[PDB]
């Protein structure tokens, strides 16, 4: 019952991901199965308010991208080391 509206990243790198992170957004990625890993771009203040709930980190999520529905869990997440925010989340496509 956790729905996260996301987008597809079109530029990626150091400079692309710091420009993206100063716009109250951050990058993510969905990977797993046998298919291509899809680079996922999604808004920060939503997912930062999602992850306080402890069933974010255990139960199956649905990332909405391109109109599709993709059922993921959350595998690995990078905090910002002295600010209460995020940089990147690893979602296993499952």
């Amino acid at each position: 019952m956790f729905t996260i509206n996301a987008e597809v990243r079109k530029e990626q790198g150091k400079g692309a991901s710091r420009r993206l992170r100063a716009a109250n957004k951050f990058p993510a990625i969905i990977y797993g199965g046998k298919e291509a890993p899809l680079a996922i771009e999604l808004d920060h203040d939503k997912v930062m308010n999602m992850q306080a709930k402890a069933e974010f980190y255990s139960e199956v999520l649905t990332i909405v991208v391109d109109g599709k529905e993709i059922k993921v869990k959350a595998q690995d997440v990078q905090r910002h080391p002295y600010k209460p925010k995020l940089q990147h989340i690893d979602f296993v496509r499952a």
Binding site: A54, Y57, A74, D76, V77, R79, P81, Y82
Partner: protein, 136 residues
């Protein structure tokens, strides 16, 4: 005064304090005291911020100190010219990058652990913040 036991070499270089930290996540405890500023803590400052922090949580509970000094600081005496060797070691500092969880705590409620790290952080030369053990 936390001090290393039988070090390799007595005197080491100055070195720069660049980069981010490693003790970012709260591992051993439930509540931590994370650094935001880039400074360095002496062994008298770790131990003074521990006495001001053990006291508020009257001793039951458990406290983990995630920093140890292991870096000697030399000091030239007064009325001594430059040169004629490196100074002699007086005290021992730990280098703190931003993000370093300094202390941790477990076994006390969330507000007493809140109101003990602030009494500890008034003894530190770096600007710290309060963090809680996060899932994953």
């Amino acid at each position: 005064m936390l001090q290393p036991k039988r070090t390799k070499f007595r005197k080491m270089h100055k070195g720069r304090n660049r980069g981010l930290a490693q003790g970012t996540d709260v591992s051993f405890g439930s509540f931590g005291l994370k650094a935001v500023g880039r400074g360095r803590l002496t062994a008298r400052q770790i131990e003074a911020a521990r006495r001001a922090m053990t006291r508020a949580v009257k001793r039951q509970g458990k406290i983990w100190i995630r920093v140890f000094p292991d870096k000697p600081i030399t000091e030239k005496p007064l009325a001594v010219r430059m040169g004629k060797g490196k100074g002699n070691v007086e005290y021992w500092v730990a280098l703190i990058q931003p993000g370093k969880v300094l202390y941790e705590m477990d076994g006390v409620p969330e507000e007493l652990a809140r109101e003990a790290f602030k009494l500890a952080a008034a003894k530190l030369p770096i600007k710290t913040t309060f963090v809680t053990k996060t899932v994953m």
